[PDB]
């Protein structure tokens, strides 16, 4: 992120199209509030729930929420695997909302 900001900052200093030099990011979505909001907004395409969220109330409603909203969801093993995907120690839930055409 720092490199991209530096590169685009040099682009602005050289007075070129900074808004079009970059491309829309394609990445997994994370964060409990962010993922829950995406599921309610029907933007989530796939939901992966950590199996051992220590306060279980944080995810206990998610299977019922995903079922009502018609969002495909899975309970995957361990919080740390989801964390290492998003470069964290922990991730309660991950969400896939958009992918590339080869991965459709």
């Amino acid at each position: 992120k720092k490199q991209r900001l530096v590169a685009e900052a040099e682009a602005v200093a050289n007075g070129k199209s900074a808004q079009d030099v970059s491309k829309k990011p394609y990445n997994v979505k994370y964060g409990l509030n962010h993922v829950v909001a995406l599921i309610e907004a029907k933007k989530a395409k796939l939901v992966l729930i950590a199996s051992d969220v220590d306060p279980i109330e944080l995810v206990v409603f998610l299977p019922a929420l995903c079922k009502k909203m018609g969002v495909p969801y899975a309970i995957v093993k361990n919080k740390a695997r989801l964390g290492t995907v998003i470069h964290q120690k922990t991730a309660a839930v991950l969400a896939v909302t958009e992918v590339r055409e080869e991965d459709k």
């Binding site: 900001l5 530096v6 685009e8 900052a9 040099e10 602005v12 200093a13 900074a18 808004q19 970059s22």
Partner: peptide, 17 residues
Amino acid sequence: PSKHEQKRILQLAYAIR
């Protein structure tokens, strides 16, 4: 484009200058 990065872009451009 993301506005908060646009502010960050201006900050880094100022630092480089």
